[PDB]
Design a protein around this motif. Structure first.
Motif, PDB file in Angstrom:
ATOM      1  N   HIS A  56       0.862  -1.183   0.000  1.00  0.00           N
ATOM      2  CA  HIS A  56       0.000   0.000   0.000  1.00  0.00           C
ATOM      3  C   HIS A  56       0.901   1.237   0.000  1.00  0.00           C
ATOM      4  O   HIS A  56       1.237   1.762   1.059  1.00  0.00           O
ATOM      5  CB  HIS A  56      -0.937   0.004   1.193  1.00  0.00           C
ATOM      6  CG  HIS A  56      -1.964   1.090   1.149  1.00  0.00           C
ATOM      7  ND1 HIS A  56      -3.184   0.989   1.779  1.00  0.00           N
ATOM      8  CD2 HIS A  56      -1.948   2.303   0.550  1.00  0.00           C
ATOM      9  CE1 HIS A  56      -3.881   2.090   1.565  1.00  0.00           C
ATOM     10  NE2 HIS A  56      -3.151   2.902   0.821  1.00  0.00           N
ATOM     11  N   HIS A  58       1.839   5.040  -2.473  1.00  0.00           N
ATOM     12  CA  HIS A  58       1.475   5.934  -3.572  1.00  0.00           C
ATOM     13  C   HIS A  58       2.760   6.450  -4.199  1.00  0.00           C
ATOM     14  O   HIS A  58       3.387   7.382  -3.683  1.00  0.00           O
ATOM     15  CB  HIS A  58       0.598   7.074  -3.095  1.00  0.00           C
ATOM     16  CG  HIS A  58      -0.711   6.599  -2.586  1.00  0.00           C
ATOM     17  ND1 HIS A  58      -1.685   6.094  -3.417  1.00  0.00           N
ATOM     18  CD2 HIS A  58      -1.178   6.462  -1.326  1.00  0.00           C
ATOM     19  CE1 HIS A  58      -2.715   5.699  -2.693  1.00  0.00           C
ATOM     20  NE2 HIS A  58      -2.434   5.920  -1.425  1.00  0.00           N
ATOM     21  N   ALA A  85      -1.501   1.804  -4.467  1.00  0.00           N
ATOM     22  CA  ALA A  85      -2.851   1.487  -4.008  1.00  0.00           C
ATOM     23  C   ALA A  85      -3.868   2.396  -4.696  1.00  0.00           C
ATOM     24  O   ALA A  85      -4.548   3.224  -4.082  1.00  0.00           O
ATOM     25  CB  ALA A  85      -2.931   1.599  -2.492  1.00  0.00           C
ATOM     26  N   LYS A 150      -8.620  -1.155  -6.477  1.00  0.00           N
ATOM     27  CA  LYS A 150      -8.657  -0.346  -5.260  1.00  0.00           C
ATOM     28  C   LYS A 150      -9.982   0.397  -5.183  1.00  0.00           C
ATOM     29  O   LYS A 150     -10.395   1.034  -6.149  1.00  0.00           O
ATOM     30  CB  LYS A 150      -7.492   0.660  -5.228  1.00  0.00           C
ATOM     31  CG  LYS A 150      -6.874   0.944  -3.844  1.00  0.00           C
ATOM     32  CD  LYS A 150      -7.870   1.433  -2.820  1.00  0.00           C
ATOM     33  CE  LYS A 150      -7.190   1.699  -1.478  1.00  0.00           C
ATOM     34  NZ  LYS A 150      -6.257   2.857  -1.632  1.00  0.00           N
ATOM     35  N   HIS A 206      -6.245   0.171   6.002  1.00  0.00           N
ATOM     36  CA  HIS A 206      -6.463   1.056   7.158  1.00  0.00           C
ATOM     37  C   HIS A 206      -7.153   0.317   8.297  1.00  0.00           C
ATOM     38  O   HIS A 206      -8.015   0.868   8.983  1.00  0.00           O
ATOM     39  CB  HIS A 206      -7.249   2.318   6.785  1.00  0.00           C
ATOM     40  CG  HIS A 206      -6.726   3.008   5.573  1.00  0.00           C
ATOM     41  ND1 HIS A 206      -5.377   3.149   5.330  1.00  0.00           N
ATOM     42  CD2 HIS A 206      -7.360   3.589   4.531  1.00  0.00           C
ATOM     43  CE1 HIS A 206      -5.203   3.795   4.194  1.00  0.00           C
ATOM     44  NE2 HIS A 206      -6.389   4.077   3.693  1.00  0.00           N
ATOM     45  N   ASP A 266       0.978   2.998   3.554  1.00  0.00           N
ATOM     46  CA  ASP A 266       0.209   4.082   2.931  1.00  0.00           C
ATOM     47  C   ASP A 266       1.077   5.330   2.790  1.00  0.00           C
ATOM     48  O   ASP A 266       0.681   6.450   3.119  1.00  0.00           O
ATOM     49  CB  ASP A 266      -1.075   4.375   3.705  1.00  0.00           C
ATOM     50  CG  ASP A 266      -1.996   5.335   2.968  1.00  0.00           C
ATOM     51  OD1 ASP A 266      -1.830   5.505   1.740  1.00  0.00           O
ATOM     52  OD2 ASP A 266      -2.851   5.962   3.626  1.00  0.00           O
TER      53      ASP A 266
HETATM   54 ZN   LIG Z   1      -3.583   5.050   0.282  1.00  0.00          ZN
END
Ligand SMILES: [Zn+2]
Ligand SMILES: [Zn+2]
Length: 376
Positions: A56, A58, A85, A150, A206, A266
């Protein structure tokens, strides 16, 4: 004759072993006497695991808000595979693919069910952007780059569509060889019950957020919808992020026996440089501080990550698999770990990635160069 030989490496169970690499693949593990073109003696002072996988991230450089360079979130932090993601949908996935062709890090992408991706923060607000044919075409175009879908199912993303996008995502899943589907959770509507009821043997990221769609009810117990989802094979991914990880939620869920299947960051440029994420190593360290063992955390970023995204030759320290390795240390270095709720936690030990080996080629991290120890 081996291409690379690591002698006296420590596995995460603390045993000493040798690892031989030939032709970009793991050739052998154990006691090894055969010759090698290059040998490194780790002197029992560094762990080696399968190359860490961050499920996960970016790392689409052209994304307006959540952007980063693949190699800044990959090899530079010891991570050999990163999975974007859903920064791009069908609109930008080609440019993403072309830019990542140069990355040393192995880059895969989850395709956003919305054609426009993270170009806007409300990508599911318009149903017209949730286009099945665009995603079918994108998948056919990049069958090996796109590893799943996603869907960010939260209030600020779906607008007035509520639970309808997830239904679409599921349909979309079916139409593309049953690709894995990653579902982001946070604020409601939709409610966690409605989201989890639609999922099956699918990944909720999350998973330890402190927002209303948290996996714990107000009494501190697991939501029954999450219990049944786990029963059906749904998996939990951490996806720490800027606002998606609570130390208190994670402590309570871990005390209930609800451990993450995968740990992921993330991460993007801002929460790497400034935010509470910093690196996958630091997120993993937070889970060590909550009480998970080192084998569990490493599993969360290797074999479990590779299984959850069907990365067949990644994540395993076994003969014949890809020669992606992470060399790291557990160093005693007092550190404050900060979660998304701005809660601090003092930790005595942190994982320090020293090198990434990718396709059998070594790359020291900044800390690996600083400590010296070994070179490639
Ligand atoms: Zn994300
Ligand atoms: Zn998210």
């Amino acid at each position: 004759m081996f291409d690379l030989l690591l002698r006296r490496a420590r596995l995460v169970d603390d045993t000493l072993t040798d690892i031989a690499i030939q032709d970009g693949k793991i050739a052998a593990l154990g006691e090894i006497s055969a010759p090698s073109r290059k040998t490194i003696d780790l002197q029992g002072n560094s762990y080696v695991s399968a190359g860490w996988i961050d499920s996960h991230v970016h790392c689409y450089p052209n994304s307006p808000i959540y952007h980063d360079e693949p190699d800044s979130v990959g090899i530079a932090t010891g991570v050999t595979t990163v999975i974007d993601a859903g920064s791009t949908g069908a609109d930008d996935v080609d440019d993403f693919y072309q830019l990542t062709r140069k990355a040393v890090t192995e880059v895969y992408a989850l395709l956003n069910i919305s054609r426009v991706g993270l170009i806007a923060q409300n990508e599911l607000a318009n149903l017209a952007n949730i286009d099945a044919e665009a995603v079918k075409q994108a998948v056919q175009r990049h069958p090996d780059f796109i590893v799943g879908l996603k869907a960010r199912m939260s209030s600020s993303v779906v607008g007035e569509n509520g639970i309808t996008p997830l239904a679409r995502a599921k349909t979309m899943q079916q139409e593309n060889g049953d690709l894995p589907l990653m579902v982001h959770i946070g604020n409601n509507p939709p409610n966690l019950d409605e989201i989890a009821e639609l999922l099956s043997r699918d990944i909720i990221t999350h998973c330890y957020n402190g927002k209303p769609n948290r996996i714990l009810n107000p009494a501190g117990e697991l939501r029954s919808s999450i219990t049944r989802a786990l029963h059906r094979g749904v998996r939990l991914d951490v996806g720490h992020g800027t606002a998606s990880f609570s130390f208190e939620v994670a402590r309570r869920a871990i005390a209930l026996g609800i451990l993450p299947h995968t740990i992921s960051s993330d991460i993007y440029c801002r929460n790497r440089i400034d935010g509470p994420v910093r690196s996958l190593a630091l997120v993993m360290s937070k889970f060590l501080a909550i009480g998970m063992t080192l084998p569990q955390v490493i599993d969360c970023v290797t074999v479990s990550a590779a299984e959850g995204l069907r990365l067949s030759r990644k994540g395993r320290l076994e003969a014949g698999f890809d020669a992606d390795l992470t060399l790291f240390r557990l160093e005693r270095q007092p550190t404050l770990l900060v979660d998304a709720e701005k809660e601090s936690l003092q930790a005595d030990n942190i994982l320090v990635p020293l090198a990434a080996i990718r396709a059998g080629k070594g790359y020291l991290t900044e800390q690996g160069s600083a400590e010296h120890a070994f070179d490639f």
